[PDB]
């Protein structure tokens, strides 16, 4: 077989290959992952900082 004859990729190729459609799909999924991980990262850095802030008894004698 020659090397100019590329193999059968048709089981995994999508049949409509618009650039903007597939790019917006992929960037929507990685954008949702970035959104949720950014909210989670904000929440854990606030968990540690609010751990450092003050205490129930120190606020009780206020």
């Amino acid at each position: 077989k020659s090397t100019y004859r590329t193999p059968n990729f048709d089981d995994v190729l999508k049949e409509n290959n618009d650039a903007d459609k597939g790019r917006s799909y992929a960037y929507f999924m990685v954008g949702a992952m970035g959104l949720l991980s950014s909210a989670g990262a904000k929440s854990t850095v606030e968990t540690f900082i609010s751990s450092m802030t003050a205490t129930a008894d120190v606020l009780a004698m206020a």
Binding site: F48, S50, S51, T53, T55, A56
Partner: protein, 385 residues
């Protein structure tokens, strides 16, 4: 050249995590190392933010832990995260070691990597024992006394090394303040040893589940294995958030909510669950000196593995007897862990002795004989004469 190569620090970061050529064949068991890195960062950060509120005297240790639980904002998150993250660190570390001795990662290009791993394992066991001793419950105190009175079996200097460990005459205020200073300290020695682990790995690169060379197709670590590690990172955080928020005192013992009392024995002194197999190994020998020698031998027998593996192909991917006896070893370890949590009653001492013998006969008897048999079967199955 690129700025990520033409720097001093970004050169190291690039060489280790960005352009690191990984074999493309490596499966999901090659994420345990980045998982242990995440676990180590979790332990160090949550421990620092709890040491900001912990007081280490014997009359203030337990109540300072409950001050963290009840009075510090999100402090139950920190304590439950530290305790369950320590136990998750050990489950992932057991998976890292079991992968390593399944796939033959201990073998001849990577023996110094295996040995730096064994040093890291000993240091993490010590760190978690000290940190369990800092909370000063009832299992904490009596665990400290039985494990430190192990060292009185040395027939010449044993009483003076145990009186040097205790700082006095039994586990009290100097012992607890010592154990806090050391339980801080040994994690940074572990971080240095992890940097040395990565340095010893980086010279030859990682193995692969085939055991053949991986030099032929390779993939840079960025954008492929970064995301393949991100999958297991989010799975591990999911399972840890389950155990932290819905089931937090499950892996722990209930007797660490009794404050430490030197006059009342809690009628079954057991350590945390991950030290139960070595506890059963220690308990199986009917002598104390031979008991601690056999426990330290049970963890130093991981060093005889690159010299007793007598076969020409690396790993158990293509061997049937190595696979079978590997899983015999793994369920022997699980039975040993369950024997270590039971009392010294009549079937359990014999079961623990036989399981300890199987644990030692795996490294010293089973792996050479099965390796040689598989060698000659691989030969005569395909050569004609």
């Amino acid at each position: 050249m690129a700025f990520r190569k033409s720097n001093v620090y970004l050169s190291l970061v690039n060489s280790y995590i960005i352009d690191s050529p990984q074999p493309s064949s490596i499966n999901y068991w090659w994420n345990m190392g980045s998982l242990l890195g995440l676990c180590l960062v979790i332990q160090i950060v949550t421990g620092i933010f709890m040491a900001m509120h912990y007081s280490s005297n014997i009359e203030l240790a337990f109540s300072s832990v409950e001050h963290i639980m009840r009075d510090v904002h999100n402090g139950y998150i920190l304590r439950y995260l530290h305790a369950n993250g320590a136990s998750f660190f050990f489950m992932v570390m057991f998976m890292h070691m079991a992968k390593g001795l399944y796939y033959g990662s201990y073998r001849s290009p990577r023996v110094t990597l295996w040995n730096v791993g064994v040093i890291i394992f000993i240091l993490t066991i010590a760190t978690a024992f000290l940190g369990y001793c800092c909370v000063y419950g009832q299992m904490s105190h009596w665990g400290a006394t039985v494990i430190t009175n192990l060292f009185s079996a040395i027939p010449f200097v044993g009483n003076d090394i145990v009186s040097w460990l205790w700082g006095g005459f039994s586990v009290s205020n100097p012992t607890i303040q010592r154990f806090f200073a050391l339980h801080y300290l040994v994690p940074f020695i572990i971080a240095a040893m992890v940097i040395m682990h990565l340095m010893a790995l980086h010279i030859h690169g990682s193995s692969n589940p085939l055991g053949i060379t991986g030099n032929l197709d390779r993939i840079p670590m960025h954008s492929y294995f970064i995301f393949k590690d991100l999958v297991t990172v989010f799975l591990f955080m999911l399972i840890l958030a389950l155990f932290v928020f819905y089931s937090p005192n499950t892996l722990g013992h209930p007797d660490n909510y009794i404050p430490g009392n030197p006059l009342v024995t809690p009628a079954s002194i057991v350590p945390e669950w991950y030290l139960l197999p070595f506890y059963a190994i220690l308990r199986s020998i009917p002598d104390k000196l031979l008991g601690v020698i056999t426990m330290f031998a049970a963890i130093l027998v991981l060093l005889v593995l690159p010299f007793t593996d007598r076969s020409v192909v690396r790993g158990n991917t293509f061997k049937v007897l190595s696979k079978f006896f590997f899983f015999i070893f793994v369920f022997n370890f699980v039975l040993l862990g369950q024997i270590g949590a039971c009392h010294v009653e009549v079937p359990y001492v014999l079961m623990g002795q036989i399981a300890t013998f199987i644990y030692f006969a795996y490294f010293l008897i089973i792996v050479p004989v099965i390796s040689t048999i598989e060698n000659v079967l691989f030969y005569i199955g395909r050569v004609n004469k």
